[PDB]
Amino acid sequence: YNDLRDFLTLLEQQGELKRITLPVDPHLEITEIADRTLRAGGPALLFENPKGYSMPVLCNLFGTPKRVAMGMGQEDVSALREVGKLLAFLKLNMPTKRLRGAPCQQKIVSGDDVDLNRIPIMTCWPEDAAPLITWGLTVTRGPHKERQNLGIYRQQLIGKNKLIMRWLSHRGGALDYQEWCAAHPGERFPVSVALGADPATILGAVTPVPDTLSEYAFAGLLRGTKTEVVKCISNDLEVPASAEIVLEGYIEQGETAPEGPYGDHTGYYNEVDSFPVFTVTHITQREDAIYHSTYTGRPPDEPAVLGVALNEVFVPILQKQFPEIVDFYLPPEGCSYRLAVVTIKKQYAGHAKRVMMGVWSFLRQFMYTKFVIVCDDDVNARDWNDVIWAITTRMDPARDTVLVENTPIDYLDFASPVSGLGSKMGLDATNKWPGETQREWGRPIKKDPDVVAHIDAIWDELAIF
Amino acid sequence: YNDLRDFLTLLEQQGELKRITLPVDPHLEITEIADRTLRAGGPALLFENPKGYSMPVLCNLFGTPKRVAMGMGQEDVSALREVGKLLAFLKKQVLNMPTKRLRGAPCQQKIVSGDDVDLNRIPIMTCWPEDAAPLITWGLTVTRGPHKERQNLGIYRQQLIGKNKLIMRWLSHRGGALDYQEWCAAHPGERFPVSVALGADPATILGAVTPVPDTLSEYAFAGLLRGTKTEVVKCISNDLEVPASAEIVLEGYIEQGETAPEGPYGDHTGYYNEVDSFPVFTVTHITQREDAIYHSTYTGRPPDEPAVLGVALNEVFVPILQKQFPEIVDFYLPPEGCSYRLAVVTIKKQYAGHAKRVMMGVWSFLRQFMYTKFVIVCDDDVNARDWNDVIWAITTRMDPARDTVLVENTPIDYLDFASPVSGLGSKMGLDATNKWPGETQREWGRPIKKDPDVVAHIDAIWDELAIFN
Ligand SMILES: Cc1cc2c3c(c1C)C(C)(C)C[C@@H](S(=O)(=O)O)N3c1c([nH]c(=O)[nH]c1=O)N2C[C@H](O)[C@H](O)[C@H](O)COP(=O)(O)O
Ligand SMILES: Cc1cc2c3c(c1C)C(C)(C)C[C@@H](S(=O)(=O)O)N3c1c([nH]c(=O)[nH]c1=O)N2C[C@H](O)[C@H](O)[C@H](O)COP(=O)(O)O
Ligand SMILES: [Mn+2]
Numbered sequence: 036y037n038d039l040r041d042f043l044t045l046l047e048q049q050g051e052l053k054r055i056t057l058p059v060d061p062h063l064e065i066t067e068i069a070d071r072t073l074r075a076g077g078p079a080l081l082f083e084n085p086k087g088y089s090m091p092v093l094c095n096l097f098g099t100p101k102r103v104a105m106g107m108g109q110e111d112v113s114a115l116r117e118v119g120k121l122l123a124f125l126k127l128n129m130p131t132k133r134l135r136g137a138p139c140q141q142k143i144v145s146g147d148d149v150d151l152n153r154i155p156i157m158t159c160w161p162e163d164a165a166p167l168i169t170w171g172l173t174v175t176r177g178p179h180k181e182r183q184n185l186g187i188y189r190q191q192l193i194g195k196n197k198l199i200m201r202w203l204s205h206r207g208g209a210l211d212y213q214e215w216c217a218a219h220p221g222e223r224f225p226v227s228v229a230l231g232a233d234p235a236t237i238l239g240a241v242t243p244v245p246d247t248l249s250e251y252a253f254a255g256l257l258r259g260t261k262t263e264v265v266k267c268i269s270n271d272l273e274v275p276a277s278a279e280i281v282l283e284g285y286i287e288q289g290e291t292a293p294e295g296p297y298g299d300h301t302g303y304y305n306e307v308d309s310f311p312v313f314t315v316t317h318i319t320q321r322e323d324a325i326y327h328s329t330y331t332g333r334p335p336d337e338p339a340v341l342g343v344a345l346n347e348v349f350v351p352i353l354q355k356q357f358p359e360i361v362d363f364y365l366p367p368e369g370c371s372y373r374l375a376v377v378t379i380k381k382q383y384a385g386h387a388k389r390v391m392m393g394v395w396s397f398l399r400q401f402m403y404t405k406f407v408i409v410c411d412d413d414v415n416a417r418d419w420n421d422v423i424w425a426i427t428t429r430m431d432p433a434r435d436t437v438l439v440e441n442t443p444i445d446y447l448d449f450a451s452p453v454s455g456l457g458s459k460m461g462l463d464a465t466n467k468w469p470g471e472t473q474r475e476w477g478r479p480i481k482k483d484p485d486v487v488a489h490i491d492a493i494w495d496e497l498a499i500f
Numbered sequence: 501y502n503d504l505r506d507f508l509t510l511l512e513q514q515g516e517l518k519r520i521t522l523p524v525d526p527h528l529e530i531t532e533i534a535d536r537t538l539r540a541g542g543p544a545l546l547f548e549n550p551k552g553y554s555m556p557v558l559c560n561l562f563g564t565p566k567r568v569a570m571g572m573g574q575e576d577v578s579a580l581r582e583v584g585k586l587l588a589f590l591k592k593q594v595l596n597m598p599t600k601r602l603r604g605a606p607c608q609q610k611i612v613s614g615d616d617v618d619l620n621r622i623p624i625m626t627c628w629p630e631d632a633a634p635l636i637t638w639g640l641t642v643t644r645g646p647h648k649e650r651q652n653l654g655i656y657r658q659q660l661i662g663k664n665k666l667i668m669r670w671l672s673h674r675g676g677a678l679d680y681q682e683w684c685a686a687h688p689g690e691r692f693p694v695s696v697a698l699g700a701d702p703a704t705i706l707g708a709v710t711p712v713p714d715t716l717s718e719y720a721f722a723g724l725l726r727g728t729k730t731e732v733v734k735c736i737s738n739d740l741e742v743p744a745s746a747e748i749v750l751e752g753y754i755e756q757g758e759t760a761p762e763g764p765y766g767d768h769t770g771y772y773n774e775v776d777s778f779p780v781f782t783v784t785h786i787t788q789r790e791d792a793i794y795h796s797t798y799t800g801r802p803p804d805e806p807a808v809l810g811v812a813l814n815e816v817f818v819p820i821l822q823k824q825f826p827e828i829v830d831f832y833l834p835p836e837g838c839s840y841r842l843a844v845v846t847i848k849k850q851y852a853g854h855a856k857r858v859m860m861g862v863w864s865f866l867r868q869f870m871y872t873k874f875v876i877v878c879d880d881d882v883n884a885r886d887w888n889d890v891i892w893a894i895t896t897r898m899d900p901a902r903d904t905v906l907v908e909n910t911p912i913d914y915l916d917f918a919s920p921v922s923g924l925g926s927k928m929g930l931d932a933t934n935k936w937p938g939e940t941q942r943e944w945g946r947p948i949k950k951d952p953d954v955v956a957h958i959d960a961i962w963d964e965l966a967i968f969n
């Protein structure tokens with residue numbers, strides 16, 4: 036049973052983890068280093084000497100697709116499709132295995148001794164409001180079901196023992212709190228946050244499994260074995276046994292604070308807004324604890340790399356429903372969800388429009404996708420050279436562009452004319468069939484597969500690079 | 501005075517030229533290798549062991565902007581801006597700078613003529629599986645018309661149809677084609693002399709493809725790029741001059757009325773174009789260097805080498821756009837948009853609705869961009885040449901219905917089969933600039949700027965951090 040430390044050791048053995056011994060400030064400096072590293076496809080980073088703290092800081096953990104795959108016990112990135120086929124069936128789901136004691140409760144501090152300032156929480160960007168916890172697995176139960184939800188919600192530092200809990204309103208945690216409030220007026224909402232759990236639990240948390248299902252159960256499937264957990268000290272929630280740090284506490288009903296501004300995955304600052312305050316009553320950690328952090332900003336960043344790997348998970352679920360779809364890609368440059376390229380084997384006139392509507396309606400994660408480009412299967416959706424080629428040789432813009440007004444949009448997307456409402460554009464860049472055009476359509480250049488394969492065979496020997 | 505070999509030596513010194521010793525077929529295989537190489541921004545390629553031939557094959561010469569620049573003796577591409585300014589003034593008497601003619605030249609070391617002419621000995625490439633025949637793609641065709649002395653150079657694709665016969669595919673507005681057409685009117689039934697040089701010095705090659713007016717010899721323009729007169733030699737069987745350092749020269753003529761079906765061939769649009777008739781070039785002489793090298797390329801689904809060339813040569817028009825629209829910081833036509841069909845323009849926006857004026861400017865100001873179907877306008881914090889910035893801008897600064905402009909019934913290239921009617925179609929502009937008050941009622945996002953002190957500090961310890969190692 037591999038905890039996070041075992042994963043770091045595996046990475047180090049493979050030249051995928053660098054230990055930095057120079058002094059580096061968690062205030063801005065770590066982010067700059069991680070950003071350059073991620074942008075060059077470099078390793079994960081363990082800062083052994085954060086200025087002013089004793090606890091090392093781990094970041095860029097999932098900065099490459101490879102390391103995301105490795106984190107689910109797979110060799111490489113195309114095994115994620117198989118995990119998609121699995122995620123299909125969940126639309127006896129294995130419980131947690133509760134241990135009696137756990138490394139994450141080796142050192143405990145509570146009440147007045149709680150001081151989040153001892154932790155090397157990072158400040159990512161110059162106009163961010165305060166240090167920000169970015170890799171916390173927040174654990175919650177609602178009043179109506181037993182399911183334990185895990186989500187990653189950014190958490191601003193506002194005191195020795197107070198964090199702001201920034202869950203957006205459709206999240207498991209947020210819905211649990213909302214229901215708790217209705218069902219138990221004025222009663223404190225217990226919550227716990229785990230930092231540095233095992234990679235399967237972390238990845239399970241971020242995968243959009245249905246609200247009905249504990250993210251712990253999914254992590255179990257990725258791992259091959261039940262998720263090892265421990266009961267929290269001050270509530271009935273369970274956290275991963277191997278976690279490096281655990282924060283336990285509650286939300287006082289009605290207590291809120293102005294959150295931000297903070298730089299986002301879109302590359303802009305979010306403006307101030309109100310979210311609940313999480314009061315921390317306990318902090319439990321391992322001996323020699325490691326603090327796991329990250330940053331979001333202009334893409335690409337670690338979340339976006341995560342999000343490309345998790346798109347591979349969705350391809351099979353889309354293909355079950357639309358078997359005409361050969362590939363489906365959300366470029367990290369499009370802020371991970373705002374633009375999709377879809378390639379199909381077109382079977383009839385107007386086919387592309389059915390596929391656009393399918394992307395905009397079938398799965399909720401794509402409901403806010405503003406641009407959808409549809410192409411034939413002779414295009415590689417992951418290469419702008421092919422996609423722009425297809426756009427500029429197979430479209431008449433007015434004929435082949437679909438615009439739909441007054442559709443749901445992310446309320447933080449400031450480019451829509453009104454908060455929560457905007458338009459969508461689909462580009463039909465498929466070959467046009469009789470009926471769709473009265474011209475003689477061009478015959479595209481296809482490569483000889485025998486020549487392709489032969490050159491694959493001698494590629495390394497040719498040694499051009 | 502640098503010939504082509506001197507250039508290949510310079511490139512090799514700088515890690516910009518790879519010699520391939522493995523056997524590779526000019527039928528399809530070279531193209532595959534060159535295509536992968538170009539798509540990865542790799543070096544130029546010299547195939548020393550082409551299957552079935554002894555003459556090495558050079559391609560991907562200009563597969564990178566850098567190598568285009570190096571080909572004109574520069575670090576970077578912006579000397580082409582100065583040419584743009586020059587060509588503007590005319591609509592400088594020592595731009596009538598002639599050729600320097602040698603008597604005897606390396607390109608006439610070995611000579612074959614009449615029945616000994618056999619183009620099949622040359623490793624002419626076949627680029628794509630349904631191409632009709634091997635195709636000569638980097639020939640500088642040289643012609644004179646009957647009325648002026650000016651020698652035109654153009655690159656016209658040339659299909660192999662016999663031991664000594666090529667098809668000459670000049671489109672009808674080309675210098676060569678106009679010369680032939682005039683020759684026909686002025687001398688009915690007389691043979692039209694023509695010559696084709698392969699592997700001239702880079703300035704001559706680049707000069708051939710610069711769009712200079714029909715009134716001027718492309719040799720004069722190569723002279724300006726080089727800093728010195730172009731070295732040439734008289735052909736053996738006619739009065740045309742070819743570059744002295746050329747690796748191979750084909751001399752001959754066009755018999756009036758002799759034509760052949762040309763193609764189909766894959767073109768820069770990525771499609772096959774259909775068969776059509778063009779004149780036949782009869783080859784009476786082939787002259788070459790000792791140890792001659794054959795210079796080739798391919799065109800296809802972009803990007804390809806011609807498209808990278810075409811990007812570098814668009815720098816010739818940027819200053820003319822900027823004289824008129826000084827708000828324009830950059831103006832880029834991606835190769836992967838068939839070189840002219842998509843433009844990315846970055847501006848310093850000065851008022852609400854500015855992007856629309858710029859779109860209309862692109863679609864109206866010069867004939868070079870009138871047929872551009874898509875135009876994306878962005879702010880100057882975007883690098884127009886990086887799809888990571890441009891997509892970021894599109895997806896964070898647009899509402900599609902508000903910010904997309906469509907105009908119907910506008911002029912479109914007759915060969916573009918995607919428009920509903922030949923010659924007529926629509927255009928789209930994407931206004932991906934930051935929206936000002938009036939354009940939006942929302943509080944627009946403040947972009948994330950880095951702390952320059954932190955950036956500089958990390959620059960200072962970067963090597964010591966040793967992240968790579
Ligand atoms: C991996 C990750 C994810 C998330 C986040 C972050 C990371 C690293 C951080 C904290 C760095 C950045 C923000 S941000 O991308 O919104 O700017 N963050 C985040 C947020 N979801 C959310 O509601 N608030 C958040 O604050 N998300 C997404 C969220 O955690 C994810 O959608 C979960 O699957 C939601 O789980 P459920 O609530 O559906 O169970
Ligand atoms: C650089 C280059 C250029 C050209 C070409 C090719 C290359 C490599 C090849 C041979 C690869 C392929 C075709 S293609 O781009 O049309 O697909 N070729 C070409 C053709 N111009 C032309 O009339 N026929 C041609 O066959 N062009 C364009 C032409 O040479 C260019 O427009 C010149 O500036 C014309 O000079 P003028 O006749 O105006 O003096
Ligand atoms: Mn959930």
Ligand SMILES: [Mn+2]
Nearest residue numbers: 652653675714
């Ligand atoms: Mn000319």
Ligand code: NA
Nearest residue numbers: 185186240241
């Ligand atoms: Na979750």
Ligand code: NA
Nearest residue numbers: 653654708718
């Ligand atoms: Na020319």
